[PDB]
């Protein structure tokens, strides 16, 4: 169905331990394709997915340029924000950048994104119009004004609506076999008695792609929120994902409970029952 | 492909 390209940048200052660490990660939906680490020996944008390795020297040259540039801007930006928020040199601080684009099954532009966070909390965000910013405080307002003078939003719009979608459409073509496959979950059920009167029913979904799944517990038609426990979608480590959902049931009432599994790769929504 | 424009101080 729908596809997306996301870029996650992290900058952490380290007082009296040297200059800050920059980490860059690129994704095409749920698959990582690029990596950059300011502490790595290479000091280059490195491939992580097989289908990106085919890109020439010019590609890795530009990608290294852009990340080195952001890396360098953040080193200054950490002290600048430390200034705005009135914080001492002793204390570790984080700057996180999230940006990218969304396209549909037709491969047509849907949305552009640009968000910034200081110490894990919202700092400055580019609105859906890609024409204006949203400052979260008086400090972020100083940046807004600076980025207003710099004509940042206009420049951000040019990339997010243009090159971002061009690159994403290109990645979908080159990595067709892995990026465009819909692997359905291999579903099964387990029973674990916790008492003589109480029992635990667990519903598993394994080896599925994309990570977007739904595991709902039902009892004689109605939904179950009370006594329903879910783990967050975890990576298998081989490009697939895993997830389970459990519910504590009274012994003998196992046939009253059903589990509905929903996935993009699954033709019809699966219903599992003990 | 990463963004290279704009990369201005905040």
């Amino acid at each position: 169905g729908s596809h997306s390209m996301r870029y996650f940048y992290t900058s952490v200052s380290r007082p009296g331990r040297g200059e800050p660490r920059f980490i860059a990660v690129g994704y095409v939906d749920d698959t990582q394709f690029v990596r950059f680490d300011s502490d790595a020996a290479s000091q280059r944008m490195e491939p992580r997915a097989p289908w990106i390795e085919q890109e020439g020297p010019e590609y890795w040259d530009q990608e290294t340029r852009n990340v080195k540039a952001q890396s360098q801007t953040d080193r200054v930006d950490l002290g600048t924000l430390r200034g705005y928020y009135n914080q001492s040199e002793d204390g570790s601080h984080t700057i996180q950048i999230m940006y990218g684009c969304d396209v549909g099954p037709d491969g047509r532009f849907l949305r552009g994104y640009r968000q910034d966070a200081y110490d894990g909390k919202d700092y400055i965000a580019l609105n859906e119009d890609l024409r204006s910013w949203t400052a979260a405080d008086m400090a972020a307002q100083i940046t807004k004004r600076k980025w207003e003078a710099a004509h940042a939003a206009e420049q951000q719009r040019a990339y997010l609506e243009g090159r971002c979608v061009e690159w994403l459409r290109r990645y979908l073509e080159n990595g067709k076999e892995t990026l465009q496959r819909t692997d359905p979950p291999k579903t099964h059920m387990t029973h674990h008695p916790i008492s003589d009167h109480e029992a635990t029913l667990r519903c598993w979904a394994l080896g599925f792609y994309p990570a977007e799944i739904t595991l709902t517990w039902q009892r004689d038609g109605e939904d179950q929120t009370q006594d329903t426990e879910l783990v967050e979608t975890r990576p298998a480590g081989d490009g697939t994902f895993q997830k389970w959902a459990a519910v504590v049931v009274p012994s003998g009432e196992e046939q009253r409970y059903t589990c509905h599994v929903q996935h993009e790769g699954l033709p019809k929504p699966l219903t599992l029952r003990w | 492909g990463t963004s290279g424009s704009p990369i201005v101080n905040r």
Partner: T-cell receptor
Framework: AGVAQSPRYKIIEKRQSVAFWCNPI?????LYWYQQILGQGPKLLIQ????????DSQLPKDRFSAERLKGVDSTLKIQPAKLEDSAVYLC?????????????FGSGTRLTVLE | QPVQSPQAVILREGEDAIINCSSS?????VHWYRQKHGEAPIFLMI?????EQKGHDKISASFNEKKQQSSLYLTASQLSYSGTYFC??????????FGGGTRLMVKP
């Protein structure tokens, strides 16, 4: 104020050292160093984003070196200078990167390396 | 990397001059600079996808995304128009790569 560059002209002897200074437009995050041999097109040497290097691939690491330690003014050094190094050393500045931003060049340093 | 054409031009005052700049790969931004006797390159116009058609005083310029070419139009040339014009090129970060140049001579 404009982009400042010291000196305007410099005569050096083949095998001696030389240093070129450059002060960009106050606030400008990006600083560039270009070498223009004769009337030809300026050839990039080094790019700086704030205090650090973005691209130094074009720098002959054997003789050339450049720093911008506090991310304001920059210095380009040649040690040792070859006759081939007789050129105008242009310094450019921009607010950042950049697609809407045009460069602001300084007057440059005219260098003549002599036998 | 960008192909600047022609390398040189001589024309009478009031004649039209058209100088173009071509790229092998897709364009980002096209920079245009003017340079005099040992002077600093002075910025004229910057063209990109936003537009495309720009102007500086009495000189106009084009950006053709499809053709991967940009042109500088010097209509009714004045003695002040000499001498060297440079076409510079994009890069995703705007890192400029200058063309060969164009020595323009306006004879009175």
């Amino acid at each position: 104020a404009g982009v400042a560059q010291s000196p305007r002209y410099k005569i050096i002897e083949k095998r001696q050292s030389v240093a070129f200074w450059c002060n960009p437009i106050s606030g400008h995050a990006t600083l560039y160093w270009y070498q223009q041999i004769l009337g030809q097109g300026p050839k990039l040497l080094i790019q700086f984003q704030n205090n650090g290097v973005v691209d130094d691939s074009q720098l002959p690491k054997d003789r050339f070196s450049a720093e911008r330690l506090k991310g304001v003014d920059s210095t380009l050094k040649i040690q040792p200078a070859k006759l081939e190094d007789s050129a105008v050393y242009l310094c450019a500045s921009s607010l950042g990167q950049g697609l809407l931003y045009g460069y602001t060049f300084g007057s440059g340093t005219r260098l003549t390396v002599l036998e | 990397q960008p192909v600047q054409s022609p390398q040189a031009v001589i024309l009478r005052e009031g004649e039209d001059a058209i100088i173009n700049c071509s790229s092998s790969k897709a364009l980002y931004s096209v920079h245009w600079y003017r340079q005099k006797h040992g002077e600093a390159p002075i910025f004229l116009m910057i063209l990109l996808k936003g537009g495309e058609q720009k102007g500086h005083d009495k000189i106009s310029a084009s950006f053709n995304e499809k053709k991967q070419q940009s042109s500088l139009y010097l209509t009714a040339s004045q003695l002040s128009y000499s001498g060297t014009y440079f076409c510079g090129l994009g890069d995703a970060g705007n890192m400029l790569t200058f063309g060969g140049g164009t020595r323009l001579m306006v004879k009175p």
